[PDB]
Amino acid sequence: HMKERPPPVPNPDYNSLKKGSLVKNLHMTEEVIVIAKWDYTAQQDQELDIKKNERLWLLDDSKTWWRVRNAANRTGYVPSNYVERK
């Protein structure tokens, strides 16, 4: 009938149009950390692959999607629905 799994991404709004923007050039002061409730797979190039119980450095969490950084100094996007700070 139907497998047992959570709903899809919370309507992602990081890209849709053909023309890109890219305006990264601002300072940020904060020391927060989030925790991925489960593991996810990088659906796009802007998104990041998170693991279960995986923690990262919270960068900017304003919209449905939050941005964090791993120990690899890498930064990506992830659905706040699959993540939960502690």
Tell me the domain boundaries of the chain: 1-86
CB 27 within 8 A of CB 39: no
Residue 44 in tokens: 């796009």
Say how far apart CA 74 and CA 6 lie, in whole Å: 27
8: how many CB neighbours lie within 10 A of its CB?
9
Give the CA dihedral 27, 62, 8, 24, nearest 10 degrees.
-20
Q: By three-state DSSP, how is residue 67 classified?
A: strand
Q: Does domain 1-86 have CATH number 2.30.30.40?
A: yes
35: how many CB neighbours lie within 10 A of its CB?
16
Say how far apart CA 14 and CA 29 lie, in whole Å: 22
9: how many CB neighbours lie within 10 A of its CB?
15
Residue 28 in tokens: 């940020």
Say how far apart CA 65 and CA 58 lie, in whole Å: 11
The residues, ordered by sequence, that sit 6+ positions from 26 with a Cβ below 8 Å of its Cβ are: none
